[PDB]
Amino acid sequence: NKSDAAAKQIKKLEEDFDGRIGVFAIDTGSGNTFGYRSDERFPLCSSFKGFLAAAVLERVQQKKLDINQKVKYESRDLEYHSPITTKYKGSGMTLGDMASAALQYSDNGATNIIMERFLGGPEGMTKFMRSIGDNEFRLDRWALELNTAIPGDKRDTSTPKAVANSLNKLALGNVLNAKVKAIYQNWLKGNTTGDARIRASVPADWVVGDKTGSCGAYGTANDYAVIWPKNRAPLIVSIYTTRKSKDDKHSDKTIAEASRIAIQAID
């Protein structure tokens, strides 16, 4: 009935902003979970960049790539919303800086460079996810063309649950060894775009790492986080939202609130 309360509250929250909320949350210490529409599909938006950065680190760990190797792109027509890569166009960036920029600022140039040169594009990004046991994740299109968030369209979607499980495996589990996993955590922790989302749902002294996404269409936005509460086992939180109409704006407040409800449901 703690589950059922949380569910009634997400249902009301989704009715209040006239859309659709998907949640999955894990207490990694007890194994307690809460889910709401946790098996429905939602657009990834930029959020897949968190997994792209893990993919790079996997390669670095296998010695397939070096984290300090220069990635040059002096001639590239940089995609919209490349605030980091724009600054370094002249000198290039380390693969590590570039992958972290893809995560921390949602840099589309970092994203697309890495997928075209190192990861085998959308298909390869999908293969990476299948290789960690994730069967729902599909990336179909490149950084800027995946944000259409069309209702019923399965392209570039996952489920809240798949997102949660995957983050758990990558951030807390055994895909990355001790050294490289720590780097991944530092990267998540240093995310700059999620202050109004899961971060806003927790005490200021809890440590958080997240990646956000915002399609800019159908009010579609999301956020996923590893949370370290004071003196407690990590939590995994995964919140995906969409909305009725093409022109609707996303609601940060709904994401923060659905996170609050989720964190309470596994308390």
Ligand X SMILES: *C(=O)[C@@H]([C@@H]1N=C(C(=O)O)[C@H](SC2CN(C3=NCCS3)C2)[C@@H]1C)[C@@H](C)O
Annotated binding site for a beta-lactam: 46, 49, 106, 108, 212
117-124: long-range pairs with CB below 8 Å, 24+: 117/71, 118/56, 118/59, 118/65, 119/52, 119/55, 119/56
Q: CA angle at residue 235 from 188 to 98, to 5 degrees?
A: 10
DSSP 123: H
Question: Quick count: other Cβ atoms within 10 Å of Cβ 174?
Answer: 10
Decide whether 53 or 183 has the Cβ nearer to Cl ion: 53
Binding site per annotation, positions: 46, 49, 106, 108, 212
The two beta strands, 221-228 and 157-158, are unpaired
| By CB under 8 A, residue 210 contacts its own copies | no
DSSP 231: T
Decide whether 44 or 208 has the Cβ nearer to Cl ion: 44
| By CB under 6 A, residue 241 contacts ligand X | no
Selected from 156, 223, 252, 257, the binder of Cl ion by CB under 5 A is 156
From the list its own copies, ligand X, Cl ion, none, partner contacted by residue 86 (C-beta under 5 to 8 A by kind): none
Strands (E), the chain: 19-27, 33-36, 42-43, 70-71, 93-94, 157-158, 207-214, 221-228, 235-243
User: For residue 89, what are its two tokens?
Assistant: 């166009």
| By CB under 8 A, residue 5 contacts its own copies | no
- Residue 18 — φ and ψ, nearest 5°? 65, 55
Restricting to residues 34-93, name those near ligand X by CB under 6 A. 45-46, 81
- DSSP helix/strand/coil, 146: coil
User: Is 46 tagged catalytic?
Assistant: yes
Residue 237 near residue 163, CB atoms below 8 Å: no
| By CB under 6 A, residue 193 contacts ligand X | yes
Question: Residue 226 carries which side chain, given as an amino acid letter?
Answer: V
* Catalytically annotated residue among 14, 38, 46, 238: 46
| By CB under 8 A, residue 84 contacts its own copies | yes
Decide whether 42 or 251 has the Cβ nearer to its own copies: 42
Selected from 154, 232, 244, 249, the binder of its own copies by CB under 8 A is 154
User: Is 145 tagged catalytic?
Assistant: yes
Nearest distance in Å: CB 179, its own copies: 9
Q: Which residues bind its own copies (CB under 8 A)?
A: 39-40, 83-84, 87-88, 94, 96-97, 100-101, 104-105, 150, 152-154, 186, 190, 192
Catalytic residues: 46, 145
Q: Which residues bind ligand X (CB under 6 A)?
A: 45-46, 81, 106, 108, 147, 192-193, 212-214, 216
